[PDB]
Amino acid sequence: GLPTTTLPGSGQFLTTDDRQSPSALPNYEPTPRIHIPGKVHNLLEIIQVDTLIPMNNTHTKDEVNSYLIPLNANRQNEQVFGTNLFIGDGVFKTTLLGEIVQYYTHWSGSLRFSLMYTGPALSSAKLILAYTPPGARGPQDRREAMLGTHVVWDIGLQSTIVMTIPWTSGVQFRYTDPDTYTSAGFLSCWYQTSLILPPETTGQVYLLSFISACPDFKLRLMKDTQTISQTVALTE
Amino acid sequence: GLPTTTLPGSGQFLTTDDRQSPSALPNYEPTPRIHIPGKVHNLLEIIQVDTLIPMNNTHTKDEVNSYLIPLNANRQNEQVFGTNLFIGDGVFKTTLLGEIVQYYTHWSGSLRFSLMYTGPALSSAKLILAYTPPGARGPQDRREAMLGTHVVWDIGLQSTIVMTIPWTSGVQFRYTDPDTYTSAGFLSCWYQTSLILPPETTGQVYLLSFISACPDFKLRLMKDTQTISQTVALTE
Amino acid sequence: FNGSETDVECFLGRAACVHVTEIQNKDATGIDNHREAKLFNDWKINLSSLVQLRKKLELFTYVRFDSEYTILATASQPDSANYSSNLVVQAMYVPPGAPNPKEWDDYTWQSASNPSVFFKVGDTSRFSVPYVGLASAYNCFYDGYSHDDAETQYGITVLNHMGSMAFRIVNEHDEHKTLVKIRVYHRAKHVEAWIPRAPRALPYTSIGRTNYPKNTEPVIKKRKGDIKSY
Amino acid sequence: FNGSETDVECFLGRAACVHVTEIQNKDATGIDNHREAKLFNDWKINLSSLVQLRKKLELFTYVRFDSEYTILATASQPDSANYSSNLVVQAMYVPPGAPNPKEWDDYTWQSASNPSVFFKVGDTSRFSVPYVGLASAYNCFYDGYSHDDAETQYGITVLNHMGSMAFRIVNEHDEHKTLVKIRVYHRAKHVEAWIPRAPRALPYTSIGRTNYPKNTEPVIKKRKGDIKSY
Asked: Minimal Cα–Cα distance from A179 to chain B, Å?
């Protein structure tokens, strides 16, 4: 009674196609839906949390000290931080933002860099931390960083320093293929003055660095995510 | 629940059939549509532009002088132009109107022949240019051209001469198969008087000839467009 | 955006190859190759095999599925030649809390209310098994044993079992060789996740037990030089 | 007229044979013929092969597609006789910015979110890949390299990559010969063009680089005699 045609692409098996399929248990009430806290609808609220950054991961075996940026006394106009802002590579790879951006593809959005001091109450220091945009060669000292968009937010009365990281569109998005190009962004910190330790301190103090994404974040295409060239078929 | 029949022509693969097909990326926002200038919706506005005609392409190697119709002094009642108006063949083949009409098939529409003089300001000449319709033998001299639909629009005060080319329907359209029949139209130019050069000029002056299609143009069926008997499967 | 790209439903709802297997049908006993991978196969479904070696689901703690197993069966023995003459394959979703076949010609292929399907080799079959969970969500990441009493097994926590797929052939006649490869693609619908969880460092070493493997290489990368970058 | 004959959408929207190829499946290694055109094939899609040797799209500068690859696969080895017994062929659209397989039994045929289809040999499959463009239009005709920095490759400009098609066979058993010919027909939908461009004189000599070939013959025709026609 109903005439119909064929379509090329018959017997097709798209893996990815959303088609309603009939039920093997057509009449079965499941265990009913209850309310449990922390309901999630999006990975944006997953990556809204400042995790931490391993910056002092320059020791061989991985320990707790991988996150402690070491601060000594009587050093000024010299290096504290320094990083390429290529998330999914280098030191940002093993953050939660790390494997999330390793999951997808081309991304967009501003960030929320945070920074926090671990030292004595009666200690003071001035730390210039500077951002240089992608496509610009990063500064070589405290001088050239100060001519950049320098941030002090000093140590001695304030511990938690947050700086937003504005995003700039390059070729419409961010390159997500493995290269060591140097146009990803650059953040680094310098002693504006020497660290003033309290008397008979005799050691080191440290900083703690966090990273996350502002609500402006964007994730566009999805990828396979090998990361180990993965194949294990072990079942029990 | 829904009874249906077959149709002969099942498993058919029409190459040319507009059928909506399911998406391999069913959920992916693309790079969004922005505005960039020169938006095109039709080939009519492509072929609305007077390009140029190579008329002095009677030299062997192709140079810049292929478009320069040569004008000498002390010649009158003799040849300047002369062409069969078979676009897609001869001297009109390598115009933009050329490969566009080589793309389609049977065509229709009036044209816009243009003509422009390249000489000194204090120079004068009378040039009769004459059109004869398709199906008529073209004139042999300035006399027989003058009894045609003669156009002077002289040289000495006016440089840019445009003449519309009216279209006449033969057997309902224009023959688009390769033959050297002589019922395609004929346009040619004659010196009504000798070219009056300025004193101690001692050389040649030239004319520049353009062609395009008026908005009355029409292109009806599409063809394969070999033009070289084309096959190259080189991929990199 | 309210677009299903970075949300949870698009995140886990893709279809992935789990449980490659290879069966045949020969005879009642015939040549002594009966038990291991021939004449039938049971899986005891567990997304613990190759959801990129348990990663995106392990990123959360509490999930709820609605599964769509799409069984792709094919004839490894040259289907182009023959070895496909009405080779009807029987799949079967044995629900949790039901006895498992361990023989090809066994009673629980035809028993009562065990959802079994039949399809041609080289074609597919689409399911929709609803959320068969003991808890209100799938406890993918659970702390606790089953009892301080008798105690079922161990803190593998197979109490929130999902099911058990069984594949076999209804055919006969040992004079010849055939071989059938069966490849099931799980797809989760209406995925509701809860309680985000920090990702693992290594690829795992066990199913169910959250053990990190010994003898590890450094999962994090050394700086290229010093804290001085570039 | 407002009829879709001479407009842009009818102009480029026809389906054309690109990328004739020829694969098979033999064994794991077997006879030493593995790598070149056997057991799999990657294309790295580029309309630069046989859109009448890049002409109608080269007539414009900026385009935007919505592609419909219709893969026609057929069994070159006599399908009339056999060599077609459930010969399931696997196609795969690897998107730009994703790793490419280089082996038949390789991890990125079954990996995560790589659109792969399965169909019978001698039948077809229809796609619709959306506009996968880095720029807002496809820069078919671009001036500039990729960087003054590291600089990706050269001014081929593979930055606006469209995709990469991969074809392979899921079958087994070296005792025999089969051969499968695969022929993909691209079709562009919703074609929006910009910035008309003067056509080429010669058939080209390179892909991406707008080079005109050396040693040329005259592309324009001499007059039959003089400026005197007829």
From this structure: 22
Start-to-end C-alpha separation, chain C: 36
CA angle at residue D164 from D162 to D167, to 5 degrees? 150
Residue A157 sits at the chain B interface (C-beta within 8 Å) = no
Q: For the domain B1-236, what is the CATH code?
A: 2.60.120.20
Residues of D in contact with B23 (CB under 8 A): 127-130
Q: Which residues have a Cβ under 8 Å from the Cβ of D51 and sit 6 or more positions away?
A: D16, D18, D57
Q: What's the reported resolution, in angstroms, to a tenth?
A: 3.8
Cross-strand pairs, A124: A196
**Total count of residues recorded for chain D:** 230
Helix (H, G, I), strand (E, B) or coil at D228: coil
Paired with C17 in beta bridges are C185
Q: Residues B117, B219: contact at Cβ < 8 Å?
A: no
Say if the Cβ atoms of A181 and D117 lie within 8 Å. no
**What burial class does residue A10 get, using C-beta atoms within 10 Å of its C-beta: 0-12 exposed, 13-18 middle, 19+ buried?**
middle
Selected residue of B27, B28, B29 to mutate for chain C interface (largest C Cβ count, 10 A)? B27
Chain C CA closest to residue A34: C136
Structure tokens that stand for D30 in this block: 């077997």
Nearest alpha carbon to residue B131 among B151, B112, B115: B151
The Cα–Cα gap between B153 and B141 comes to: 18
Tell me which chains share at least 3 CB pairs under 8 Å with chain D.
A, B, C
- The shortest CB-CB distance from C122 to any of D82, D86, D175 is to D86
Contact (CB<8Å) B23/D62: no
Name the residue type at position A52.
L
Check residue B109 and report its DSSP letter. Answer: -
| Nearest beta carbon to residue A82 from set C43, C62, C229 | C229
Cβ within 8 Å, pair A38-C64: no
Residue C36 to residue C54: CA distance in whole angstroms: 26
d(CA C32, CA C50): 32
Q: Among D83, D110, D112, whose Cβ lies nearest the Cβ of C80?
A: D83
User: What's D153-207 look like in SS3?
Assistant: CCCCCCCCCCCEEEEEECCCCCCCCCCEEEEEEECECCCEEEEECCCCCCCCCCC
Read out DSSP for chain A?
-------SSTT---SS-------SSSS---SPP---S-EE-BSTTTTTS---------SSS--GGGG-EEE-BS--SSBS--EE--TTSTTSTTSHHHHHHHHSSSEE--EEEEEEEES-TT-BB-EEEEEE-TTSPPPSSHHHHHHTEEE---BTT--EEEEEE----SBSB---SS---S-S-EEEEEESS-BBPPTT--S-EEEEEEEEE-TT-EE-------SS--------
Q: Which of B148, B164, B166, B163 is nearest to B116 (CA)?
A: B163
Hey, are the CB atoms on A91 and C223 less than 8 Å from each other? yes
State the DSSP code for C109.
G
C-alpha angle with apex A88: A83 to A92, nearest 5 degrees? 40
Is residue B138 within 8 A of residue D229, CB to CB? The reply is yes
Q: What is the spatial distance between Cα B72 and Cα B67, in angstroms, rounded to a whole number?
A: 16
Enumerate residues 153 to 182 of chain D having a beta carbon within 8 A of any beta carbon in chain C: 170-173, 175-176, 178
C35 contacts C168 by C-beta, under 8 angstroms: no
- Method for this entry: cryo-EM
C82 shares contact with chain D (CB less than 8 Å): yes
The answer to whether residue D92 neighbours chain C at the CB level (below 8 Å) is no
* Single-letter amino acid, residue B35: H
Residue pointed to by tokens 């949790």 = C96
- Nearest-Cα distance to chain A for D109, in Å, is 10
Distance CA A180, CA A173 (A): 17
Q: Rounded to whole angstroms, what are the CA distances from C114 to B89, C68, C159, C187, D214? A: 76, 17, 20, 21, 74
